[PDB]
Design an enzyme around this catalytic site. Structure first.
Site, PDB file in Angstrom:
ATOM      1  N   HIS A 213       9.983   3.424 -41.525  1.00 40.74           N
ATOM      2  CA  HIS A 213      11.117   4.255 -41.915  1.00 40.74           C
ATOM      3  C   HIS A 213      11.704   3.871 -43.268  1.00 40.74           C
ATOM      4  O   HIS A 213      12.494   4.643 -43.824  1.00 40.74           O
ATOM      5  CB  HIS A 213      12.231   4.164 -40.866  1.00 40.74           C
ATOM      6  CG  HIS A 213      11.872   4.752 -39.539  1.00 40.74           C
ATOM      7  ND1 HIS A 213      11.455   6.059 -39.396  1.00 40.74           N
ATOM      8  CD2 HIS A 213      11.901   4.224 -38.291  1.00 40.74           C
ATOM      9  CE1 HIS A 213      11.236   6.309 -38.117  1.00 40.74           C
ATOM     10  NE2 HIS A 213      11.503   5.214 -37.426  1.00 40.74           N
TER      11      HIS A 213
ATOM     12  N   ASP B  64       3.069   4.980 -33.912  1.00 45.74           N
ATOM     13  CA  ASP B  64       4.453   4.857 -33.474  1.00 45.74           C
ATOM     14  C   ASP B  64       4.961   6.226 -33.025  1.00 45.74           C
ATOM     15  O   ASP B  64       4.529   7.264 -33.528  1.00 45.74           O
ATOM     16  CB  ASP B  64       5.292   4.272 -34.627  1.00 45.74           C
ATOM     17  CG  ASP B  64       6.725   3.913 -34.223  1.00 45.74           C
ATOM     18  OD1 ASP B  64       7.556   4.829 -34.040  1.00 45.74           O
ATOM     19  OD2 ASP B  64       7.036   2.703 -34.129  1.00 45.74           O
TER      20      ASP B  64
ATOM     21  N   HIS C 176       7.696   7.618 -33.459  1.00 43.39           N
ATOM     22  CA  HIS C 176       8.514   8.256 -34.480  1.00 43.39           C
ATOM     23  C   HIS C 176       7.684   8.545 -35.724  1.00 43.39           C
ATOM     24  O   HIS C 176       6.704   7.859 -36.004  1.00 43.39           O
ATOM     25  CB  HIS C 176       9.695   7.367 -34.849  1.00 43.39           C
ATOM     26  CG  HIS C 176      10.540   6.984 -33.672  1.00 43.39           C
ATOM     27  ND1 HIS C 176      10.378   5.796 -32.994  1.00 43.39           N
ATOM     28  CD2 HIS C 176      11.533   7.647 -33.038  1.00 43.39           C
ATOM     29  CE1 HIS C 176      11.252   5.732 -32.002  1.00 43.39           C
ATOM     30  NE2 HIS C 176      11.959   6.847 -32.002  1.00 43.39           N
TER      31      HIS C 176
ATOM     32  N   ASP D  36       6.139   2.356 -29.016  1.00 44.71           N
ATOM     33  CA  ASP D  36       7.201   3.065 -28.330  1.00 44.71           C
ATOM     34  C   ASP D  36       6.755   4.406 -27.769  1.00 44.71           C
ATOM     35  O   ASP D  36       7.568   5.101 -27.160  1.00 44.71           O
ATOM     36  CB  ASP D  36       8.435   3.244 -29.236  1.00 44.71           C
ATOM     37  CG  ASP D  36       8.096   3.509 -30.700  1.00 44.71           C
ATOM     38  OD1 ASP D  36       6.921   3.777 -31.062  1.00 44.71           O
ATOM     39  OD2 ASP D  36       9.064   3.450 -31.493  1.00 44.71           O
TER      40      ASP D  36
ATOM     41  N   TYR E 190       9.803  -1.022 -27.522  1.00 45.57           N
ATOM     42  CA  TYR E 190      10.985  -1.738 -27.054  1.00 45.57           C
ATOM     43  C   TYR E 190      10.986  -2.101 -25.572  1.00 45.57           C
ATOM     44  O   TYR E 190      11.915  -2.780 -25.129  1.00 45.57           O
ATOM     45  CB  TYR E 190      12.252  -0.932 -27.405  1.00 45.57           C
ATOM     46  CG  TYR E 190      12.228  -0.625 -28.876  1.00 45.57           C
ATOM     47  CD1 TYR E 190      12.541  -1.604 -29.810  1.00 45.57           C
ATOM     48  CD2 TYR E 190      11.788   0.610 -29.332  1.00 45.57           C
ATOM     49  CE1 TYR E 190      12.448  -1.351 -31.162  1.00 45.57           C
ATOM     50  CE2 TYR E 190      11.708   0.881 -30.676  1.00 45.57           C
ATOM     51  CZ  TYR E 190      12.036  -0.100 -31.589  1.00 45.57           C
ATOM     52  OH  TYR E 190      11.941   0.175 -32.934  1.00 45.57           O
TER      53      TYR E 190
HETATM   54  O1  LIG Z   1      12.056   2.054 -35.363  1.00 41.09           O
HETATM   55  C1  LIG Z   1      12.344   2.740 -34.366  1.00 41.09           C
HETATM   56  N1  LIG Z   1      11.625   2.785 -33.227  1.00 41.09           N
HETATM   57  O2  LIG Z   1      10.676   2.083 -33.154  1.00 41.09           O
HETATM   58  C2  LIG Z   1      13.648   3.284 -34.153  1.00 41.09           C
HETATM   59  C3  LIG Z   1      14.369   3.585 -35.209  1.00 41.09           C
HETATM   60  C4  LIG Z   1      15.620   3.943 -35.004  1.00 41.09           C
HETATM   61  C5  LIG Z   1      16.183   3.908 -33.763  1.00 41.09           C
HETATM   62  C6  LIG Z   1      17.634   4.308 -33.645  1.00 41.09           C
HETATM   63  N2  LIG Z   1      17.896   5.051 -32.500  1.00 41.09           N
HETATM   64  C7  LIG Z   1      17.743   6.457 -32.569  1.00 41.09           C
HETATM   65  C8  LIG Z   1      16.702   7.040 -31.619  1.00 41.09           C
HETATM   66  C9  LIG Z   1      17.144   7.741 -30.552  1.00 41.09           C
HETATM   67  C10 LIG Z   1      16.249   8.276 -29.704  1.00 41.09           C
HETATM   68  C11 LIG Z   1      14.930   8.050 -29.954  1.00 41.09           C
HETATM   69  N3  LIG Z   1      14.529   7.374 -30.961  1.00 41.09           N
HETATM   70  C12 LIG Z   1      15.328   6.876 -31.769  1.00 41.09           C
HETATM   71  S1  LIG Z   1      18.962   4.406 -31.389  1.00 41.09           S
HETATM   72  O3  LIG Z   1      18.828   3.159 -31.170  1.00 41.09           O
HETATM   73  O4  LIG Z   1      18.738   5.047 -30.328  1.00 41.09           O
HETATM   74  C13 LIG Z   1      20.606   4.824 -31.952  1.00 41.09           C
HETATM   75  C14 LIG Z   1      21.271   5.857 -31.371  1.00 41.09           C
HETATM   76  C15 LIG Z   1      22.535   6.171 -31.795  1.00 41.09           C
HETATM   77  F1  LIG Z   1      23.233   7.158 -31.236  1.00 41.09           F
HETATM   78  C16 LIG Z   1      23.046   5.456 -32.825  1.00 41.09           C
HETATM   79  F2  LIG Z   1      24.253   5.748 -33.216  1.00 41.09           F
HETATM   80  C17 LIG Z   1      22.371   4.412 -33.452  1.00 41.09           C
HETATM   81  F3  LIG Z   1      22.920   3.703 -34.427  1.00 41.09           F
HETATM   82  C18 LIG Z   1      21.135   4.113 -33.004  1.00 41.09           C
HETATM   83  F4  LIG Z   1      20.451   3.126 -33.496  1.00 41.09           F
HETATM   84  C19 LIG Z   1      15.441   3.578 -32.684  1.00 41.09           C
HETATM   85  C20 LIG Z   1      14.166   3.221 -32.853  1.00 41.09           C
HETATM   86  K   LIG Z   2       4.024   8.038 -35.986  1.00 40.86           K
HETATM   87 ZN   LIG Z   3       9.303   4.003 -33.437  1.00 44.78          ZN
END
Ligand SMILES: O=C(NO)c1ccc(CN(Cc2cccnc2)S(=O)(=O)c2cc(F)c(F)c(F)c2F)cc1
Ligand SMILES: [K+]
Ligand SMILES: [Zn+2]
Ligand SMILES: [K+]
Ligand SMILES: [K+]
Length: 355
Positions: free
Chosen positions: A133, A171, A173, A264, A304
């Site tokens: 990212h 990944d 995402h 993930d 995770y």
């Molecule tokens: O690199 C990643 N994955 O590998 C990865 C990168 C970012 C996140 C952050 N998320 C968003 C998310 C949600 C659903 C599915 N995917 C990702 S969060 O944690 O859910 C989160 C939610 C909030 F509402 C918030 F305000 C945050 F600040 C925040 F961080 C997760 C993973």
């Molecule tokens: K990907």
């Molecule tokens: Zn991811």
């Protein structure tokens, strides 16, 4: 035929000061390492040392302002770490974060060098924080510097500038930073599979849709495989690899394969909502080993569920070591067929293997 492995417990020092249960846990990498010990895979690998990326290496992909700001966080007071972290989308910072990001990248540079000098055939990098990212100018989504993108540019810097590098990003995402860094580039083929949900799934950008094929000389060298309306798993990832990933990759004929290997999309992940199995990830690895004379570097990104990522990445290393692929199971989901067909129509103009 040697498989390399890089792991350094110093990358555990990056941590969330205020939330010891934040999912991007220090023990993500120690748990994967432990499972390699338990399965007696560690002694089968040659250990590649970690090192710090240099600032000149970071500048292969990032601006001097972005480098300078993350560097300054090493000396920030807690109030300033919180305020800086809040300037980004989904970032926490501690005084050790810069060092760990440098170690994650330098670990992957050493692994790519070991592959490109013929010292190992392939390698696995158990590293954190993640990278895909991260953008030229900014941190995002638990990522500070784009380790996989930097590694591709580092590879070109020690070989030839136009070395053909394929980045397969499985990944769950979209790797928005990787796509953007290489969007105008034909020397680095970016292929991402990701949960998309019509732009609603993180990172919430329509940049991740199948119609973004690249820009300028890079047209056709960006392949987005977006999933909608389905708990995707092994049949859907195998179908995408059969119809898109492998025909395109073979036509591209990479000289090095990097995997942005987030786990993930695995069964049990708290965020991805998908159900790829450890046996599924093994088969994806085994297919990629048929490219680039086996030159494959697997780089940890997200993932995770500590148990899921430990089993999943360990199975990938087992494949790199030459072990036989495990049995696979359940019909293919039609929504996956819709996505695959959308990518075929977008990319058949550029890739004669799809015609
Ligand atoms: O690199 C990643 N994955 O590998 C990865 C990168 C970012 C996140 C952050 N998320 C968003 C998310 C949600 C659903 C599915 N995917 C990702 S969060 O944690 O859910 C989160 C939610 C909030 F509402 C918030 F305000 C945050 F600040 C925040 F961080 C997760 C993973
Ligand atoms: K990907
Ligand atoms: Zn991811
Ligand atoms: K874009
Ligand atoms: K590209």
């Amino acid at each position: 035929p040697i498989t390399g492995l890089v792991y350094d417990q110093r990358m555990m020092l990056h941590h969330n000061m205020w939330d010891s249960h934040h999912p991007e846990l220090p023990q993500r990498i120690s748990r994967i390492f432990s499972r390699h010990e338990e399965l007696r895979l560690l002694s089968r690998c040659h250990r590649i040392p970690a090192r710090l990326a240099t600032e000149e290496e970071l500048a292969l992909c990032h601006s001097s302002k972005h480098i300078s700001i993350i560097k300054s966080s090493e000396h920030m007071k807690p109030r300033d770490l919180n305020r800086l972290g809040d300037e980004y989308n989904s970032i926490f910072i501690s005084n050790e974060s810069y060092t760990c990001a440098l170690l994650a990248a330098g670990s992957c540079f050493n692994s790519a060098q070991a592959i490109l000098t013929g010292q190992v055939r392939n390698a696995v990098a158990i590293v954190r924080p993640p990278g895909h990212h991260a953008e030229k100018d900014t941190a995002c989504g638990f990522c500070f510097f784009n380790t996989a993108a930097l590694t591709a540019r580092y590879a070109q810097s020690i070989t030839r500038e136009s070395l053909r590098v394929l980045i397969v990003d499985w990944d769950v995402h979209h790797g928005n930073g990787t796509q953007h860094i290489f969007e105008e580039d034909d020397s680095v083929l970016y292929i991402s599979l990701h949960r998309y949900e019509d732009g609603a799934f993180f990172p919430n950008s329509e940049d991740a849709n199948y119609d973004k094929v690249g820009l300028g000389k890079g047209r056709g060298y960006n392949v987005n495989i977006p999933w909608n309306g389905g708990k995707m798993g092994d049949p859907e990832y195998m179908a995408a690899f059969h119809h898109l990933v492998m025909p395109i990759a073979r036509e591209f004929a990479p000289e090095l394969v990097l995997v942005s290997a987030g786990f993930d999309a695995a069964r049990g992940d708290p965020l991805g909502g998908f159900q790829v199995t450890p046996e599924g990830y093994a088969h994806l690895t085994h297919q990629l080993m048929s490219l680039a004379a086996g030159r494959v570097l697997i780089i940890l990104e997200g993932g995770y569920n500590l148990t899921s990522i430990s089993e999943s990445m360990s199975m990938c290393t087992s494949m790199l070591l030459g072990d036989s692929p495990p049995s696979l199971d359940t019909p293919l989901k039609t929504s996956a067929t819709v996505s695959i067909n959308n990518v075929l129509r977008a990319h058949a103009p550029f890739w004669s293997s799809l015609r």
